[model samples]
Target: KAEYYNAWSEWERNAPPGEQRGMAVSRLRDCLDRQAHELELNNLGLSSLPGIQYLPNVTKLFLNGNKLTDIKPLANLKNLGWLFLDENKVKDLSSLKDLKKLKSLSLEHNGISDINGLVHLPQLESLYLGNNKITDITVLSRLTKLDTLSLEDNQISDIVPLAGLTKLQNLYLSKNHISDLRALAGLKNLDVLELFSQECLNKPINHQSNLVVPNTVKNTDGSLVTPEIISDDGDYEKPNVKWHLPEFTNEVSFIFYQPVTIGKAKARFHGRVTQPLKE
Candidate 1:
């Protein structure tokens, strides 16, 4: 295993020297050219990886539930496809730039604040970066082929870049700082979505989740309706005045000033509507 010299050094310091010196290698030997193409290594409370270096051929690697802080050592992997480093302390993703064949990567609940290195993996289709310190997604606009992306519970305030990912079918932005729902207006193919805390026009974000829009509203025509609004007061402009709810109906009318600060401001103006006009 001298060809595997570097893999041995890190193990010596991180684990029992003589007891498990051959433990990891021994476990990996059975995995060589075997039927199993994936490795499940989790919940060991390990601060460091002992024998991950020998997994050059593994197609899928699950390293979740560990206390690892730095995974730069995984840069040695060759042509890897699926990698799950969730629930770890990973803060840097630069080590994965070289994995040209990578298609899916999950960094959920980590210390990641920067993800510019992911731009190198254009073939990547699915990414999970939820519950982190991510505040910007400027590089994500380039992932034109991405199909699913989860950014829930982060510090994201701008999702203008998300509109560019027209291929997205599943997007989770709940509990973030997103205040603009229009950023997702162009995603015609979107099948799933999430949002949080709307104040005035309390509306369900997506119909699939089956959650009810809090308030009952009506158009100028008296048709019962409710408009949707995100609760985030982040970067978007508050619709205090310019935000207008039009009178009756589909596509034509005006109701009231936006931000709906006064509870049920629409109700205050409902009596003002004499009829719901047809377009």
Candidate 2:
């Protein structure tokens, strides 16, 4: 029985070390082959991914709702197609550039300001980037296969880069600093384009020169309707102005404007609007 005892001792020595972290690391070893290709490690409060590099065959990985600031270990996941990384503290995306096979990615509720790494991912189809600090999207022109993209609640000012993405079907650009809609004329496939906030509306759409409303907007007369101003006071010297919008793709883009008070004499107009951005 000494030989059996020695074998048991060897197994015990090779076993994973700690309790919580060790079990999570040991679980990664279970998916050594293609049979087990999905791994769920979400909301574990994981600050570090210790044994994630071993799972080369993992195609789908959920690491959302964690404390992970660095994800360099995930660079080895060549077969990763679907990756969920929402509600994390990750600010850098340079490590995800190598995931060429990635199709769908969710990076919502993160501190991601730069997306230059996404230029390398050509096969990406669906991308969610809501609640981020992204301002530059020039790299998105390369992703022709993209069908759905969400850039809600960001600091985006210019959307000229999105004009080339003709394949885009659904686009969410609410809670942004975009005042121009001329770039949206080429997107014929776009079915849903959200550009409104519950609290505030986008800037006035009628201000742009040579702005051709997209084909999706069903303005029969092809005339820009003057907004019916509604205010609490009888006079036009109030703080807020509610607008009654015209028909555009059977969707109502409400307008609410409130001027910021610099002094009793001078005030700056901070306006918001909901309108069909089309060609």
Candidate 3:
């Protein structure tokens, strides 16, 4: 009933020059001569994207989620504005400097650790560097026009470089070892801030309360006073009110009572009681 292959084949012949041929260089050359505006050859399982320079009038190119290890072909796309190369094995993007008109770029889920190449794109506004090995983004300070930046799931610990981008609106830095948020104070225009993870806490909260007491013994009496054996019941009283319980005591006969509050209800009781036992 429905002609799927025939329909696609008809469109291929009449379609803009480079839109039909995905991995075919001859088809791309024909499309370039016709002045096609957009081209997509993503996920062709090709190790390299050859003949990309054939598309002279192309403005948008989508080569993302491919096996491309090198992006040298992109340098020739001078008229290219939007480039998508996400989920690729691309290592060096320094050659992309020729694409000065590039505005939006997506390098997410790639192996791009060095962002030195991005400094050349002065007109870039939206950048997605999520899920990469990038540790230092200090080079991004030069891109003053950046509006939306996504650097989620990276190794960036210091966000000090982001302070310079005053025009930032949406920022996603989730899943990182960043502790200090003081650097974000400079971003006066920031509206959406997503820094997920407890590690984002300004400082580490040492869990000293859960520490196990060490063994100790009374110097005067030859009795074991294991602090661990003592329960947190108010009934057990110490002889000397001034002397605090040692970590772990070997003497089991001497029972020690340490005050531990569970919630706000118990906390109020601890603050009120402060009287010493009569000697």
Top candidate on TM-score is: 2
- Model 1, 109-148: lDDT tens per residue? 9878888888878888899998898888898988888888
lDDT tens string, model 2, 1-279? Answer: 345334434443443433234444544544553347897777766666653444566899998877677888789888899999999878887888889999999999987998888887989999999999988989888989999999988988777889889888888877786544556656767767675542233333552222332212111122222323322211122222233334233222433332222112222222243443332
Give the Cα lDDT of each candidate. 0.59, 0.64, 0.60
Question: Which ranges of candidate 1 are over 4 A from the true structure?
Answer: 2-6, 9-12, 15-26, 32-36, 50-56, 197-279
Lowest lDDT block of 10, candidate 2: 260-269
Q: Write the per-residue lDDT of candidate 3 for residues 107-204, one digit (tens) a residue.
A: 98887898898879978899999889988888888888888899988888777888778788777777665544456656667666665541221222
Give the Å error, residue 42, model 1.
1.4
TM-score-best of 1 and 2: 2
As a TM-score, model 2 comes out at 0.66
Native RMSD of candidate 3 (Å): 15.9
TM-score of 3: 0.63
Q: Candidate 1's error at 172, in angstroms? A: 0.3
Model 3, position 17, has a per-residue lDDT of 27
